[PDB]
Design a protein around this motif. Structure first.
Motif, mmCIF file in Angstrom:
data_model
loop_
_atom_site.group_PDB
_atom_site.id
_atom_site.type_symbol
_atom_site.label_atom_id
_atom_site.label_comp_id
_atom_site.label_asym_id
_atom_site.label_seq_id
_atom_site.Cartn_x
_atom_site.Cartn_y
_atom_site.Cartn_z
ATOM 1 N N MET A 1 -2.278 -2.678 11.796
ATOM 2 C CA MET A 1 -2.737 -1.802 11.962
ATOM 3 C C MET A 1 -4.288 -1.789 11.479
ATOM 4 S SD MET A 1 -0.760 2.018 11.863
ATOM 5 C CE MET A 1 0.610 0.389 10.478
ATOM 6 N N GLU A 2 -5.854 -0.947 11.640
ATOM 7 C CA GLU A 2 -7.032 -1.083 11.021
ATOM 8 C C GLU A 2 -6.309 -0.554 9.203
ATOM 9 O OE1 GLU A 2 -9.801 0.122 13.417
ATOM 10 O OE2 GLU A 2 -10.920 1.560 12.062
ATOM 11 N N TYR A 3 -6.899 -1.753 8.426
ATOM 12 C CA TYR A 3 -6.935 -1.095 7.154
ATOM 13 C C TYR A 3 -7.617 0.468 6.945
ATOM 14 C CZ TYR A 3 -6.947 -0.971 1.959
ATOM 15 O OH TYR A 3 -7.618 -1.412 0.693
ATOM 16 N N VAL A 4 -7.815 1.509 6.029
ATOM 17 C CA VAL A 4 -8.736 2.647 5.967
ATOM 18 C C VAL A 4 -8.459 2.596 4.246
ATOM 19 C CG1 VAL A 4 -8.797 4.294 6.430
ATOM 20 C CG2 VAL A 4 -7.638 3.520 7.970
ATOM 21 N N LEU B 1 -5.419 8.839 6.094
ATOM 22 C CA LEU B 1 -5.985 8.267 5.521
ATOM 23 C C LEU B 1 -7.623 8.245 5.335
ATOM 24 C CD1 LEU B 1 -4.154 5.164 6.465
ATOM 25 C CD2 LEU B 1 -3.666 6.427 4.636
ATOM 26 N N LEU C 1 1.001 -1.357 -0.026
ATOM 27 C CA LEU C 1 -0.019 -0.316 0.040
ATOM 28 C C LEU C 1 0.742 1.406 -0.064
ATOM 29 C CD1 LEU C 1 -2.475 -1.113 2.872
ATOM 30 C CD2 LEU C 1 -2.657 -0.773 0.711
ATOM 31 N N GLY C 2 2.280 1.330 0.124
ATOM 32 C CA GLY C 2 2.968 2.328 0.598
ATOM 33 C C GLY C 2 4.601 2.008 0.706
ATOM 34 N N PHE D 1 -5.504 3.247 -3.420
ATOM 35 C CA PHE D 1 -4.383 3.453 -3.354
ATOM 36 C C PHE D 1 -3.932 3.276 -4.991
ATOM 37 C CE2 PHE D 1 -5.857 1.948 0.753
ATOM 38 C CZ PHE D 1 -5.063 3.095 1.223
ATOM 39 N N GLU E 1 -5.059 7.957 0.318
ATOM 40 C CA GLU E 1 -4.367 9.204 1.056
ATOM 41 C C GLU E 1 -4.699 9.994 0.767
ATOM 42 O OE1 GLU E 1 -0.202 8.908 -0.022
ATOM 43 O OE2 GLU E 1 0.011 6.701 1.251
ATOM 44 N N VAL F 1 3.984 -0.976 3.876
ATOM 45 C CA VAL F 1 2.997 -1.163 3.972
ATOM 46 C C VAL F 1 2.302 -1.811 3.383
ATOM 47 C CG1 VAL F 1 0.447 -0.151 5.865
ATOM 48 C CG2 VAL F 1 3.250 1.264 5.777
ATOM 49 N N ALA G 1 -3.787 -3.385 7.631
ATOM 50 C CA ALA G 1 -2.417 -2.718 6.730
ATOM 51 C C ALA G 1 -1.468 -3.228 8.188
ATOM 52 C CB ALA G 1 -2.275 -1.127 6.711
ATOM 53 N N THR H 1 -2.301 8.590 10.565
ATOM 54 C CA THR H 1 -0.992 7.335 10.138
ATOM 55 C C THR H 1 0.398 7.748 10.799
ATOM 56 O OG1 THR H 1 -0.251 4.791 9.830
ATOM 57 C CG2 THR H 1 -1.035 6.978 8.143
ATOM 58 N N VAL I 1 -5.067 6.048 13.549
ATOM 59 C CA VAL I 1 -5.488 4.883 13.265
ATOM 60 C C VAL I 1 -5.174 3.506 14.493
ATOM 61 C CG1 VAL I 1 -2.531 4.723 13.182
ATOM 62 C CG2 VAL I 1 -4.898 3.583 11.523
HETATM 63 N N1 LIG Z 1 -4.488 1.334 5.887
HETATM 64 C C1 LIG Z 1 -3.659 2.086 6.034
HETATM 65 C C2 LIG Z 1 -2.389 2.227 6.354
HETATM 66 C C3 LIG Z 1 -1.291 3.203 6.025
HETATM 67 N N2 LIG Z 1 -0.929 3.172 5.412
HETATM 68 C C4 LIG Z 1 0.768 3.855 4.674
HETATM 69 C C5 LIG Z 1 0.671 3.601 3.210
HETATM 70 C C6 LIG Z 1 -1.518 3.815 2.194
HETATM 71 C C7 LIG Z 1 -1.373 3.038 4.098
HETATM 72 N N3 LIG Z 1 -0.590 3.260 7.104
HETATM 73 N N4 LIG Z 1 -0.738 3.027 8.401
HETATM 74 C C8 LIG Z 1 -2.483 2.111 7.910
HETATM 75 N N5 LIG Z 1 -3.091 1.997 9.021
#
Ligand SMILES: N#Cc1c(N2CCCC2)n[nH]c1N
Lengths: 13, 353
Positions: free
Chosen positions: B123-126, B176, B52-53, B330, B130, B60, B73, B186, B107
Protein backbone atom coordinates in the motif's frame (compact mmCIF):
# COMPACT_ATOMS: atom_id res chain seq x y z
CA UNK A 1 -9.37 3.23 34.55
CA UNK A 2 -9.05 1.63 31.12
CA UNK A 3 -6.83 0.67 28.22
CA UNK A 4 -4.44 3.39 27.04
CA UNK A 5 -2.26 1.43 24.63
CA UNK A 6 -3.00 0.14 21.17
CA UNK A 7 -6.10 -2.06 21.04
CA UNK A 8 -6.18 -5.31 19.08
CA UNK A 9 -9.28 -6.18 17.13
CA UNK A 10 -10.90 -9.55 17.79
CA UNK A 11 -12.09 -11.85 15.01
CA UNK A 12 -14.50 -13.82 17.26
CA UNK A 13 -16.19 -13.55 20.65
CA UNK B 1 -37.81 27.01 9.36
CA UNK B 2 -34.14 26.63 10.24
CA UNK B 3 -33.03 27.44 6.67
CA UNK B 4 -34.14 30.33 4.52
CA UNK B 5 -34.95 30.04 0.83
CA UNK B 6 -31.44 30.25 -0.62
CA UNK B 7 -29.96 27.93 2.01
CA UNK B 8 -32.61 25.24 1.59
CA UNK B 9 -32.23 25.22 -2.20
CA UNK B 10 -28.43 25.07 -2.03
CA UNK B 11 -28.58 22.15 0.40
CA UNK B 12 -31.06 20.23 -1.72
CA UNK B 13 -28.99 20.69 -4.85
CA UNK B 14 -25.88 19.61 -2.92
CA UNK B 15 -27.64 16.43 -1.78
CA UNK B 16 -28.72 15.60 -5.34
CA UNK B 17 -25.13 16.05 -6.52
CA UNK B 18 -24.00 13.59 -3.84
CA UNK B 19 -26.45 11.06 -5.27
CA UNK B 20 -25.01 11.59 -8.75
CA UNK B 21 -21.44 11.15 -7.47
CA UNK B 22 -22.30 7.99 -5.58
CA UNK B 23 -24.05 6.46 -8.59
CA UNK B 24 -20.92 6.94 -10.70
CA UNK B 25 -18.73 5.68 -7.86
CA UNK B 26 -20.80 2.50 -7.69
CA UNK B 27 -20.38 1.88 -11.42
CA UNK B 28 -16.62 2.24 -11.07
CA UNK B 29 -16.46 0.03 -7.98
CA UNK B 30 -18.45 -2.81 -9.52
CA UNK B 31 -16.18 -3.01 -12.57
CA UNK B 32 -13.16 -3.58 -10.31
CA UNK B 33 -15.13 -5.81 -7.90
CA UNK B 34 -16.24 -8.09 -10.74
CA UNK B 35 -12.67 -8.56 -12.06
CA UNK B 36 -9.99 -8.10 -9.37
CA UNK B 37 -6.20 -8.04 -9.72
CA UNK B 38 -3.56 -10.30 -8.21
CA UNK B 39 0.12 -11.28 -8.35
CA UNK B 40 1.23 -7.79 -9.37
CA UNK B 41 4.69 -8.08 -7.71
CA UNK B 42 6.94 -10.40 -5.69
CA UNK B 43 8.89 -10.17 -2.46
CA UNK B 44 12.38 -9.72 -3.92
CA UNK B 45 11.16 -6.55 -5.65
CA UNK B 46 11.38 -4.72 -2.31
CA UNK B 47 13.95 -3.91 0.34
CA UNK B 48 12.47 -4.19 3.83
CA UNK B 49 13.33 -1.18 5.98
CA UNK B 50 11.44 -1.11 9.28
CA UNK B 51 8.36 -2.43 11.05
CA UNK B 52 5.68 0.27 11.28
CA UNK B 53 3.12 -1.71 13.26
CA UNK B 54 2.15 -5.20 14.34
CA UNK B 55 -1.00 -7.27 14.65
CA UNK B 56 -2.15 -10.81 15.37
CA UNK B 57 -1.32 -12.21 11.91
CA UNK B 58 1.91 -10.36 11.10
CA UNK B 59 3.20 -6.83 10.60
CA UNK B 60 3.22 -3.76 8.39
CA UNK B 61 6.68 -2.80 7.18
CA UNK B 62 8.15 0.16 5.41
CA UNK B 63 9.63 -1.24 2.20
CA UNK B 64 11.48 0.33 -0.71
CA UNK B 65 10.76 -0.80 -4.26
CA UNK B 66 14.16 -1.69 -5.70
CA UNK B 67 13.50 -0.60 -9.29
CA UNK B 68 11.63 2.68 -8.80
CA UNK B 69 12.90 3.64 -5.34
CA UNK B 70 9.35 4.38 -4.20
CA UNK B 71 8.50 3.68 -0.57
CA UNK B 72 5.46 1.61 0.38
CA UNK B 73 3.78 0.04 3.40
CA UNK B 74 3.72 -3.77 3.10
CA UNK B 75 1.28 -5.77 5.20
CA UNK B 76 2.57 -9.32 5.73
CA UNK B 77 0.15 -12.02 6.91
CA UNK B 78 1.39 -15.43 8.06
CA UNK B 79 -0.97 -17.84 6.31
CA UNK B 80 -0.64 -20.33 9.17
CA UNK B 81 -1.61 -17.62 11.69
CA UNK B 82 -4.77 -16.95 9.67
CA UNK B 83 -6.21 -20.09 11.29
CA UNK B 84 -9.89 -19.58 12.09
CA UNK B 85 -12.64 -19.71 9.47
CA UNK B 86 -13.59 -16.06 9.84
CA UNK B 87 -9.92 -15.01 9.87
CA UNK B 88 -9.55 -16.56 6.37
CA UNK B 89 -12.74 -15.07 4.87
CA UNK B 90 -11.86 -11.67 6.34
CA UNK B 91 -8.44 -11.62 4.66
CA UNK B 92 -10.02 -12.30 1.26
CA UNK B 93 -12.55 -9.54 1.96
CA UNK B 94 -9.75 -7.12 2.76
CA UNK B 95 -7.81 -7.65 -0.48
CA UNK B 96 -10.83 -7.67 -2.75
CA UNK B 97 -12.33 -4.50 -1.26
CA UNK B 98 -9.07 -2.57 -1.18
CA UNK B 99 -8.32 -3.29 -4.82
CA UNK B 100 -11.80 -2.08 -5.85
CA UNK B 101 -12.41 1.13 -3.86
CA UNK B 102 -11.24 4.65 -4.69
CA UNK B 103 -11.70 7.61 -2.34
CA UNK B 104 -9.34 10.39 -1.14
CA UNK B 105 -9.32 9.16 2.48
CA UNK B 106 -8.91 5.43 1.74
CA UNK B 107 -5.38 4.09 1.48
CA UNK B 108 -4.43 2.89 -2.00
CA UNK B 109 -3.38 -0.71 -2.62
CA UNK B 110 -0.58 -0.89 -5.18
CA UNK B 111 0.45 -4.55 -5.25
CA UNK B 112 -0.83 -7.89 -3.96
CA UNK B 113 0.84 -11.32 -3.97
CA UNK B 114 1.51 -14.45 -1.90
CA UNK B 115 4.18 -17.11 -1.43
CA UNK B 116 4.58 -20.41 0.39
CA UNK B 117 4.21 -18.86 3.85
CA UNK B 118 2.63 -15.40 3.65
CA UNK B 119 0.15 -13.06 2.03
CA UNK B 120 1.31 -9.57 1.06
CA UNK B 121 -0.56 -6.31 0.49
CA UNK B 122 1.61 -3.40 -0.64
CA UNK B 123 0.00 0.00 0.00
CA UNK B 124 0.82 3.68 -0.10
CA UNK B 125 3.12 4.70 2.75
CA UNK B 126 1.48 7.42 4.87
CA UNK B 127 4.37 9.07 6.72
CA UNK B 128 2.58 11.26 9.27
CA UNK B 129 1.90 8.38 11.64
CA UNK B 130 -1.22 7.09 13.34
CA UNK B 131 -3.84 9.43 14.74
CA UNK B 132 -3.55 7.22 17.82
CA UNK B 133 -0.04 8.35 18.76
CA UNK B 134 -0.71 12.06 18.09
CA UNK B 135 -3.88 11.86 20.21
CA UNK B 136 -2.16 10.07 23.09
CA UNK B 137 0.74 12.56 22.97
CA UNK B 138 -1.40 15.73 23.07
CA UNK B 139 -4.16 14.29 25.26
CA UNK B 140 -7.23 15.44 23.37
CA UNK B 141 -8.09 17.37 20.20
CA UNK B 142 -10.04 20.59 20.20
CA UNK B 143 -13.58 20.33 18.88
CA UNK B 144 -12.67 22.05 15.57
CA UNK B 145 -9.72 19.65 15.21
CA UNK B 146 -11.84 16.59 15.99
CA UNK B 147 -14.52 17.88 13.60
CA UNK B 148 -12.05 18.15 10.70
CA UNK B 149 -11.11 14.48 11.10
CA UNK B 150 -14.70 13.37 11.79
CA UNK B 151 -15.94 15.00 8.59
CA UNK B 152 -13.52 12.85 6.59
CA UNK B 153 -14.84 9.69 8.27
CA UNK B 154 -18.45 10.73 7.61
CA UNK B 155 -17.72 11.15 3.90
CA UNK B 156 -15.73 7.91 3.77
CA UNK B 157 -18.57 5.94 5.38
CA UNK B 158 -21.11 7.61 3.09
CA UNK B 159 -18.98 6.32 0.19
CA UNK B 160 -18.43 2.82 1.58
CA UNK B 161 -22.04 2.29 2.67
CA UNK B 162 -23.31 3.36 -0.78
CA UNK B 163 -21.30 0.38 -2.13
CA UNK B 164 -22.86 -1.91 0.53
CA UNK B 165 -19.51 -2.03 2.35
CA UNK B 166 -19.33 -2.01 6.14
CA UNK B 167 -15.95 -1.06 7.65
CA UNK B 168 -16.26 -2.51 11.20
CA UNK B 169 -12.91 -1.42 12.73
CA UNK B 170 -12.95 2.35 13.15
CA UNK B 171 -10.44 3.53 15.79
CA UNK B 172 -7.51 6.01 15.93
CA UNK B 173 -4.99 3.17 15.43
CA UNK B 174 -6.38 2.66 11.91
CA UNK B 175 -6.34 6.32 10.85
CA UNK B 176 -3.07 7.58 9.36
CA UNK B 177 -2.19 11.26 8.86
CA UNK B 178 -0.84 12.15 5.42
CA UNK B 179 1.61 14.89 4.40
CA UNK B 180 -1.25 17.40 4.05
CA UNK B 181 -2.72 16.57 7.46
CA UNK B 182 -5.66 14.60 6.06
CA UNK B 183 -6.77 11.09 7.05
CA UNK B 184 -6.02 7.80 5.33
CA UNK B 185 -8.14 4.88 6.55
CA UNK B 186 -6.22 1.61 6.57
CA UNK B 187 -6.81 -1.96 7.75
CA UNK B 188 -9.77 -3.37 5.85
CA UNK B 189 -9.42 -6.70 7.63
CA UNK B 190 -12.98 -6.39 8.96
CA UNK B 191 -14.57 -4.72 5.92
CA UNK B 192 -17.32 -6.68 4.20
CA UNK B 193 -19.84 -6.33 1.41
CA UNK B 194 -23.22 -6.72 3.12
CA UNK B 195 -26.58 -6.02 1.49
CA UNK B 196 -28.61 -6.23 4.70
CA UNK B 197 -27.48 -7.99 7.88
CA UNK B 198 -24.35 -9.85 8.87
CA UNK B 199 -23.56 -11.91 11.96
CA UNK B 200 -19.78 -12.17 12.67
CA UNK B 201 -18.74 -11.22 16.20
CA UNK B 202 -15.74 -9.04 15.36
CA UNK B 203 -14.18 -5.64 15.97
CA UNK B 204 -12.37 -3.84 18.76
CA UNK B 205 -14.06 -3.96 22.20
CA UNK B 206 -14.23 -0.21 22.94
CA UNK B 207 -15.76 0.48 19.50
CA UNK B 208 -18.33 -2.36 19.33
CA UNK B 209 -21.97 -1.45 18.90
CA UNK B 210 -24.33 -3.09 21.42
CA UNK B 211 -26.04 -5.20 18.75
CA UNK B 212 -22.69 -6.87 17.96
CA UNK B 213 -22.05 -7.70 21.64
CA UNK B 214 -25.61 -9.04 21.92
CA UNK B 215 -25.09 -11.52 19.04
CA UNK B 216 -27.76 -9.87 16.90
CA UNK B 217 -27.68 -9.74 13.13
CA UNK B 218 -26.51 -6.21 12.49
CA UNK B 219 -26.06 -3.74 9.67
CA UNK B 220 -24.02 -0.71 8.57
CA UNK B 221 -25.31 1.27 11.54
CA UNK B 222 -22.52 -0.30 13.59
CA UNK B 223 -20.14 2.05 11.75
CA UNK B 224 -22.15 5.08 12.85
CA UNK B 225 -22.02 3.94 16.47
CA UNK B 226 -18.25 3.56 16.08
CA UNK B 227 -18.07 7.12 14.70
CA UNK B 228 -19.65 8.28 17.94
CA UNK B 229 -16.99 6.42 19.92
CA UNK B 230 -14.25 7.96 17.74
CA UNK B 231 -15.50 11.54 18.04
CA UNK B 232 -15.86 11.13 21.82
CA UNK B 233 -12.31 9.73 22.12
CA UNK B 234 -10.81 12.44 19.89
CA UNK B 235 -12.51 15.22 21.90
CA UNK B 236 -12.08 13.69 25.40
CA UNK B 237 -8.82 11.77 25.06
CA UNK B 238 -10.42 8.48 26.16
CA UNK B 239 -13.39 6.54 24.79
CA UNK B 240 -16.89 6.56 26.33
CA UNK B 241 -16.87 2.91 27.49
CA UNK B 242 -13.57 2.57 29.27
CA UNK B 243 -12.44 -0.34 31.46
CA UNK B 244 -9.41 -2.57 31.84
CA UNK B 245 -11.08 -5.81 30.68
CA UNK B 246 -13.27 -6.46 27.60
CA UNK B 247 -16.13 -8.02 29.61
CA UNK B 248 -16.35 -4.79 31.65
CA UNK B 249 -16.30 -2.71 28.46
CA UNK B 250 -19.15 -4.77 27.02
CA UNK B 251 -21.31 -4.24 30.12
CA UNK B 252 -20.93 -0.45 29.83
CA UNK B 253 -21.75 -0.45 26.09
CA UNK B 254 -25.04 -2.31 26.44
CA UNK B 255 -26.25 -0.26 29.44
CA UNK B 256 -27.35 2.69 27.30
CA UNK B 257 -25.51 5.18 29.58
CA UNK B 258 -22.83 7.69 28.53
CA UNK B 259 -21.22 10.47 30.56
CA UNK B 260 -19.49 13.46 28.95
CA UNK B 261 -16.59 15.70 30.03
CA UNK B 262 -17.74 19.07 31.31
CA UNK B 263 -15.83 20.77 28.47
CA UNK B 264 -17.91 19.12 25.70
CA UNK B 265 -20.16 21.60 23.92
CA UNK B 266 -23.89 20.95 24.04
CA UNK B 267 -23.86 20.51 20.25
CA UNK B 268 -21.23 17.79 20.59
CA UNK B 269 -23.13 16.01 23.35
CA UNK B 270 -26.33 16.10 21.28
CA UNK B 271 -24.58 14.58 18.26
CA UNK B 272 -22.96 11.88 20.39
CA UNK B 273 -26.22 10.96 22.15
CA UNK B 274 -27.74 10.36 18.71
CA UNK B 275 -24.78 8.28 17.41
CA UNK B 276 -24.27 6.33 20.66
CA UNK B 277 -27.92 5.32 20.55
CA UNK B 278 -28.69 1.72 21.53
CA UNK B 279 -32.15 1.90 19.88
CA UNK B 280 -31.58 1.33 16.16
CA UNK B 281 -34.89 3.03 15.28
CA UNK B 282 -33.32 6.23 16.70
CA UNK B 283 -29.62 6.05 15.78
CA UNK B 284 -28.33 8.74 13.45
CA UNK B 285 -27.18 7.28 10.16
CA UNK B 286 -29.91 4.62 10.37
CA UNK B 287 -33.00 6.80 9.88
CA UNK B 288 -35.05 7.88 6.87
CA UNK B 289 -32.72 10.81 6.17
CA UNK B 290 -29.65 8.60 6.35
CA UNK B 291 -26.26 10.31 6.48
CA UNK B 292 -27.90 13.71 6.16
CA UNK B 293 -28.98 13.63 9.82
CA UNK B 294 -25.27 13.66 10.63
CA UNK B 295 -24.05 16.06 7.96
CA UNK B 296 -26.75 18.60 8.82
CA UNK B 297 -26.31 18.42 12.59
CA UNK B 298 -25.47 21.68 14.37
CA UNK B 299 -22.03 20.41 15.39
CA UNK B 300 -21.09 20.23 11.68
CA UNK B 301 -22.64 23.60 10.78
CA UNK B 302 -19.24 25.12 9.94
CA UNK B 303 -18.16 22.12 7.84
CA UNK B 304 -17.86 22.71 4.09
CA UNK B 305 -18.35 19.13 2.99
CA UNK B 306 -17.24 19.68 -0.63
CA UNK B 307 -14.14 21.55 0.50
CA UNK B 308 -13.19 18.67 2.81
CA UNK B 309 -13.59 16.20 -0.05
CA UNK B 310 -11.43 18.42 -2.29
CA UNK B 311 -8.84 18.70 0.52
CA UNK B 312 -9.00 22.50 0.37
CA UNK B 313 -9.55 23.06 4.12
CA UNK B 314 -6.44 23.97 6.08
CA UNK B 315 -5.53 21.00 8.25
CA UNK B 316 -5.13 21.58 11.99
CA UNK B 317 -1.80 19.75 11.99
CA UNK B 318 0.81 19.09 9.28
CA UNK B 319 3.22 16.25 10.21
CA UNK B 320 6.94 16.88 10.09
CA UNK B 321 8.54 14.83 7.31
CA UNK B 322 12.29 14.82 6.68
CA UNK B 323 12.14 13.08 3.30
CA UNK B 324 10.97 9.88 1.65
CA UNK B 325 11.32 6.84 3.88
CA UNK B 326 11.40 8.88 7.11
CA UNK B 327 9.75 6.90 9.94
CA UNK B 328 10.07 9.47 12.74
CA UNK B 329 6.28 9.64 13.26
CA UNK B 330 5.97 5.91 14.09
CA UNK B 331 6.74 3.99 17.26
CA UNK B 332 9.39 1.26 17.27
CA UNK B 333 8.60 -2.46 17.22
CA UNK B 334 10.59 -5.65 17.62
CA UNK B 335 11.96 -6.79 14.27
CA UNK B 336 11.57 -10.42 13.22
CA UNK B 337 13.12 -11.79 10.04
CA UNK B 338 10.67 -12.77 7.31
CA UNK B 339 10.91 -16.52 6.65
CA UNK B 340 9.50 -18.25 3.56
CA UNK B 341 9.08 -22.02 3.93
CA UNK B 342 10.22 -24.45 1.27
CA UNK B 343 6.72 -25.94 1.24
CA UNK B 344 3.50 -24.20 0.29
CA UNK B 345 1.28 -23.71 3.33
CA UNK B 346 -2.53 -23.44 3.27
CA UNK B 347 -2.62 -23.36 -0.52
CA UNK B 348 -6.27 -24.32 -0.90
CA UNK B 349 -7.53 -21.86 1.73
CA UNK B 350 -6.05 -18.86 -0.11
CA UNK B 351 -6.54 -19.86 -3.75
CA UNK B 352 -8.55 -16.70 -4.47
CA UNK B 353 -5.94 -14.34 -2.97
N1 LIG C 1 1.73 3.71 6.08
C1 LIG C 1 1.03 2.83 6.32
C2 LIG C 1 0.11 1.77 6.55
C3 LIG C 1 -0.24 1.02 7.73
N2 LIG C 1 0.35 1.11 8.97
C4 LIG C 1 -0.01 0.22 10.08
C5 LIG C 1 1.02 0.54 11.14
C6 LIG C 1 1.44 1.95 10.85
C7 LIG C 1 1.43 2.03 9.34
N3 LIG C 1 -1.23 0.18 7.51
N4 LIG C 1 -1.54 0.37 6.18
C8 LIG C 1 -0.78 1.30 5.59
N5 LIG C 1 -0.96 1.72 4.34
Amino acid sequence: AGRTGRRQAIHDI
Amino acid sequence: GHMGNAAAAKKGSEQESVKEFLAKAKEEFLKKWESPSQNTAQLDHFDRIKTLGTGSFGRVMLVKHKETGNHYAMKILDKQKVVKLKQIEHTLNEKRILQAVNFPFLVKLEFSFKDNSNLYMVMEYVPGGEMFSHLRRIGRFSEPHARFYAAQIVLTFEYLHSLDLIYRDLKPENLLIDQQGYIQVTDFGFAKRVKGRTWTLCGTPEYLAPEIILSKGYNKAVDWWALGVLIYEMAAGYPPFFADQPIQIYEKIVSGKVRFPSHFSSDLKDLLRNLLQVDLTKRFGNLKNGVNDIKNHKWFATTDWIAIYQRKVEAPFIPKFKGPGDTSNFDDYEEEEIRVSINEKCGKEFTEF
